Design a protein around this ligand. Structure first.
Ligand SMILES: [K+]
Ligand SMILES: [K+]
Ligand SMILES: [K+]
Ligand SMILES: [K+]
Ligand SMILES: [K+]
Ligand SMILES: [K+]
Ligand SMILES: [K+]
Ligand SMILES: [K+]
Ligand SMILES: [Mg+2]
Ligand SMILES: [Mg+2]
Ligand SMILES: [Mg+2]
Ligand SMILES: [Mg+2]
Ligand SMILES: [Mg+2]
Ligand SMILES: [Mg+2]
Ligand SMILES: [Mg+2]
Ligand SMILES: [Mg+2]
Ligand SMILES: [Mg+2]
Ligand SMILES: [Mg+2]
Ligand SMILES: [Mg+2]
Ligand SMILES: [Mg+2]
Ligand SMILES: [Mg+2]
Ligand SMILES: [Mg+2]
Ligand SMILES: [Mg+2]
Ligand SMILES: [Mg+2]
Ligand SMILES: [Mg+2]
Ligand SMILES: [Mg+2]
Ligand SMILES: [Mg+2]
Ligand SMILES: [Mg+2]
Ligand SMILES: [Mg+2]
Ligand SMILES: [Mg+2]
Ligand SMILES: [Mg+2]
Ligand SMILES: [Mg+2]
Ligand SMILES: [Mg+2]
Lengths: 132, 117, 208, 313
RNA sequence: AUAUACCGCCAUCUUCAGCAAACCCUGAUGAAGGCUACAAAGUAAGCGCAAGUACCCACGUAAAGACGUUAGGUCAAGGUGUAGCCC
RNA sequence: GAUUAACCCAAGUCAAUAGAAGCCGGCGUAAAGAGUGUUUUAGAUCACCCCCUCCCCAAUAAAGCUAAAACUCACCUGAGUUGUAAAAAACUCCAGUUGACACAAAAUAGACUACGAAAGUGGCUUUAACAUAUCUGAACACACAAUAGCUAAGACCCAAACUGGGAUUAGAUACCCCACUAUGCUUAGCCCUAAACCUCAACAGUUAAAUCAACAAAACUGCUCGCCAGAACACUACGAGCCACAGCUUAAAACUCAAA
């Protein structure tokens, strides 16, 4: 039986998001990609470097906004601009979200030597697609 | 007339020894048995045994045994088609008294009641 | 199959189509109006409307084909038909005016009659009974009789007993032998008949 | 996820305001903005390449989006509105009752283009869930109604449960007859066999010359079977030696190229034969593109179908 | 060291169509069982199949394939519980 | 096991042993209706009232008889017959037709359900003949009791333990094939055993209430006799009785187990 990236059926009490509810074979069919860049196009270079950067930013944001992320990050690269789009919860005070945005954008801009912007969308609670 | 069942079974009140010892309760089921496929046998051997007789006398030369060979060939063809015919008529029930499937739907509507309601 | 079940096989027969309407029956009229609504498979690249088309020779050719090499299989067939015709013209010119009438020079007539002389009328099937397998004489359908005649002819020509003889010379010689009720393929038929005869007492073991 | 009437009413108010916003975004008249324009604007503004269209961005009217919900089936006093409520299938059995009642009244008084609706379409007209045997029983009752001397009132009713099906004609299309600089009538068609692609120009009048990539057909096709394929279309309609052909073929092997040319010539030849002859070519397999193409190899097996040897145990 | 503590990714039946929450009913309120369409106690969310999608079609081939089975495979992908080594 | 804490009782605590604490329940399948019938002394209330299946069907004993099928002999024909999943061994004074011809066994009837205490009894005839004008009742008696077996004298078609041969098998002391004996039959005496089970005691009565663990052949009342009380040891040991001498009946204990 296939296991990869499959949230398994339970008793009907486990809330899953839309991202979680779709196995890998639905990628490009029902669900899109969580990062968009040119490295994996034919004739393009530096796919390995974009992949390492993406893995770091996901770990970095998980621990920089601990308990606040309500879904996976969406990573967008245009030119040398890096856009991080995150769906977060509404528990932390707005002052802390502004501190962490200023801190994260600045720290990541100096780390990867590119202008980095963080876009936060807040939701009252994790959006539930279905109960498995 | 159905044979009698009075005094046939070992029961309280029945002085005599039992006449019948049914291993299953004598109670009508709500289903009949399934049409039992009949045992098949080798066919056309009579025609097969006339062909193989001429061969023995004609050193297995088909030119001398044409009429007998054509008989056996036709007989096998008829038995091949006959099985195809029977099979169709067996499922349709063209000759059957009734189909176990049809005869069981009828018993479902009038089930035997060995209990009180 | 890449054809859905809805696709019907193509009917390649010029005569079937030119037949006048009046000659048609009410059943044949329905089939013709029906096919106009049906899907038709593409015609395979083998059979055509040619008047020189022979389904038996095309089938014998495919049973000679090794590894999809139809060109070679077809080449051998036409070389056998040419070798048969040349051997008959040589027997014809060397014969007397009386014998000439009985000498067949058409290789298609020889090919067809040679196979019909090798078709076995009875067959043998193995049947498990009482812990020993028994050979049992059984009638054979016409399809199976024709196939066995071809398979025995090709098998005989592929036998290693023939040393350095090319297939068109081997097959042509075997066809002319069978055309005259001689040769090893006719003997193979007679043996199957003798084995089926000797196993006559075991015919009852068949249940169909 | 039940949806109340107040919820749908709010969703329609949002769609009408958003419909005017979307028209304002694209600089189009909000009054003449149709649903086809909405779909076009949403596809541009929110481009999605997801293979399943149902997963793509959509801005539809609430009636199209949300499922049909049955309304409450009893009032404040708790009394159900319909006399067949307690069956659990009031809509289905009310229909059976109405059809059964019509069959009775008839007694007291006395195909190609249409089909019966499927169970999933009946289950929407009724807004109930149905078994398969329920569907059959209802259809058996409608068929029993056609066999009777049904009048006009009994015919509008049966047509509600009949869905028009668009039969597609199998009649072969005919290419236009074109004329060259010299005024010679000709037709042009194309054919595909495996990876071979052919384009054939069949002239109305000729002597039987066939040019394949500028070469005589017998020089281009030295294999006699490839030439029989070229003969097949013309021979079948009794037109050997009556047309000139100039065709070009690329891709595939020698046999696939002969098949692609055969199909291209047959399609182009249909312009110069009678309609009855075109139907005979169709029924002879001369106008059908062969869909038989090489199957991919699968991983873990030797070929497209052949498996690796099952190792001796 | 332990895959007989596990996550992860899988084999296998599966070239299957079943799994099942919550209720209801039958059996004197036992382990258990629950269907007959001219119908007789079952209603069933959800999961799988199916449907959709990919490839050249509506075909085919891929993909998919639940719950479980074999303490099946892997502590040597990586991570890791327990135990152990630390000149 | 140590240690910490806790619990119980407490000038006691509680290890071993012993005693106290048991018959109105059951007997189709869990142990149990003893193979069958019949007394006395007794017991019961089912005996008077008050009533409806007498005779015939396959009880039993004796004598006589024989239709079908065998065996044997004879004449005439045939070269094989037998054996089967398939073979071998076996017979070849063998086989087939016809005729003559049982101390053996008893198609059909019988889809009947009768007789007898049970065991048993289903070809024909004849003779004799099937207890009890309350019920229960003998394991302290009496008379019976399938098959097998024993003793003695006969009969002998067929079947058939054992034994021999053939085949199978790793082996085959079996299953399969052939041959043949004890034995199955009769007479006269023994033996006294069966899943002798319809595992359901006799007699009288009831169908309503609670119908009723399950299954089996619905649930019960009155009365009486017989029998039963965890498994195994044990259809055993010992004692006793017996025409029984490798037998039958009656029938335990020790050790062992937490089940059966
Ligand atoms: K694992
Ligand atoms: K590991
Ligand atoms: K570890
Ligand atoms: K003390
Ligand atoms: K006994
Ligand atoms: K009888
Ligand atoms: K008799
Ligand atoms: K019994
Ligand atoms: Mg797999
Ligand atoms: Mg009584
Ligand atoms: Mg029984
Ligand atoms: Mg291959
Ligand atoms: Mg494991
Ligand atoms: Mg598909
Ligand atoms: Mg697959
Ligand atoms: Mg699927
Ligand atoms: Mg293991
Ligand atoms: Mg007992
Ligand atoms: Mg008794
Ligand atoms: Mg007694
Ligand atoms: Mg008495
Ligand atoms: Mg005795
Ligand atoms: Mg005796
Ligand atoms: Mg004997
Ligand atoms: Mg004797
Ligand atoms: Mg006698
Ligand atoms: Mg008895
Ligand atoms: Mg007893
Ligand atoms: Mg008594
Ligand atoms: Mg005991
Ligand atoms: Mg004993
Ligand atoms: Mg004893
Ligand atoms: Mg003693």
């Amino acid at each position: 039986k296939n296991r990869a990236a499959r949230v398994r059926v339970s008793k009907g009490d486990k809330p899953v998001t839309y991202e979680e509810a779709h196995a890998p074979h639905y990628i490009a069919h029902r669900k899109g990609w969580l990062s968009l860049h040119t490295g994996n196009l034919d004739g393009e270079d530096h796919a390995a470097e974009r992949t390492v950067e993406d893995v770091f930013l996901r770990k970095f944001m998980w621990g920089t906004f601990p308990g606040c992320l309500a879904d996976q990050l969406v990573l967008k690269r245009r030119g040398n601009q890096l856009e991080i789009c995150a769906v977060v919860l509404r528990q932390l005070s707005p002052h802390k979200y502004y501190f962490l945005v200023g801190y994260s954008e600045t720290l990541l801009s100096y780390f990867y030597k590119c202008p980095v912007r963080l876009h936060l969308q807040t939701v009252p609670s994790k959006v539930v697609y279905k109960y498995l | 007339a159905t044979p009698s069942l009075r005094g046939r079974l070992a029961r309280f009140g029945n002085p005599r020894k039992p006449v019948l010892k049914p291993n299953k309760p004598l109670i009508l089921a709500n289903r009949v048995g399934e049409r039992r496929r009949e045992k098949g046998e080798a066919t056309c051997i009579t025609e097969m045994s006339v062909m193989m007789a001429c061969w023995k006398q004609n050193e297995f030369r088909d030119d001398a045994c044409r009429k007998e060979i054509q008989g056996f060939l036709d007989c096998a063809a008829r038995a091949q088609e006959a099985r195809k015919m029977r099979s169709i008529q067996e499922t349709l029930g063209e000759s059957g008294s009734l189909l176990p499937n049809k005869l069981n739907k009828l018993l479902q509507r009038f089930p035997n009641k060995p209990y009180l309601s | 199959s890449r054809y859905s079940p809805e696709f019907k096989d193509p009917l390649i027969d010029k005569e079937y189509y030119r037949k006048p309407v009046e000659e048609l029956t009410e059943e044949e009229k329905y089939v013709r109006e029906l096919k106009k609504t049906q899907l038709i498979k593409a015609a395979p690249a083998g059979k055509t409307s040619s008047v020189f088309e022979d389904p038996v020779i095309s089938k014998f050719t495919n049973m000679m084909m090794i590894g999809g090499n139809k060109v070679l299989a077809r080449s051998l067939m036409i070389q056998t038909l040419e070798a048969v015709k040349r051997k008959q013209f040589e027997k014809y010119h060397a014969a007397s005016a009386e014998e000439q009438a009985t000498i067949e020079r058409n290789p298609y007539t020889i090919f067809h009659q040679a196979l019909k002389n090798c078709e076995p009328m009875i067959g043998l099937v193995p049947i498990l009974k009482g812990g020993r397998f028994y050979q049992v004489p059984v009638p054979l359908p016409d399809r199976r009789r024709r196939f066995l005649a071809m398979k025995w002819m090709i098998t005989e020509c592929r036998d290693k007993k023939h040393q350095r003889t090319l297939m068109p010379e081997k097959l042509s010689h075997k066809l002319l032998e069978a055309f005259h009720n001689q040769g090893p393929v006719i003997k193979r038929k007679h043996d199957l008949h003798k084995m089926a005869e000797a196993n006559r007492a075991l015919a009852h073991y068949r249940w169909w | 996820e039940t949806y109340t009437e107040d919820f749908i009413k709010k969703q329609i108010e949002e769609f009408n305001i958003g419909k005017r916003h979307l028209a304002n975004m694209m600089g189009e008249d909000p009054e003449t903005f149709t649903q086809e324009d909405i779909d076009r604007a949403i596809a541009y503004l929110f481009p999605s390449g997801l293979f399943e269209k149902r997963a793509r961005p959509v801005m539809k009217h609430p009636e199209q989006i949300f499922p049909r919900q049955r309304a409450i089936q009893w009032g404040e006093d708790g009394r159900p509105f319909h006399y067949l409520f307690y069956t659990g299938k009031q809509s289905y059995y009310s229909l059976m009752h109405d059809v059964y009642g019509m069959l009775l009244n008839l007694e007291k008084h006395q195909v190609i283009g249409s089909r019966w609706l499927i169970k999933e379409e009946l289950e929407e007209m009724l807004v109930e869930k149905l078994s398969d045997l329920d569907y059959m029983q209802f259809i058996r009752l409608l068929e029993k109604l056609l066999t009777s001397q049904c009048g006009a009132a009994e015919e509008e009713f049966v047509q509600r449960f009949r869905r028009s099906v668009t039969l597609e004609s199998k009649k072969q299309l005919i290419e236009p007859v074109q004329y060259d600089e010299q005024g010679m009538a000709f037709s042009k068609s194309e054919g595909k066999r495996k990876t071979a692609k052919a384009e054939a120009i069949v002239y109305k009048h000729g002597s039987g010359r066939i040019k394949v990539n500028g070469i005589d057909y017998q020089l281009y096709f030295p294999i006699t079977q490839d030439r029989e394929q070229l003969m097949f279309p013309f021979h079948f309609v009794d037109r050997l030696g009556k047309h000139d052909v100039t065709c070009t073929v690329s891709g595939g092997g020698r046999s696939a190229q002969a098949g692609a040319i055969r199909l291209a010539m047959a399609k182009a030849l249909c312009s110069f034969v009678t309609e009855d002859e075109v139907e005979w070519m169709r029924q002879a397999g001369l106008l059908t593109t062969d869909p038989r193409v090489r199957e991919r190899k699968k991983p873990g097996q030797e070929g497209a179908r052949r498996k690796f040897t099952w190792k001796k145990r």
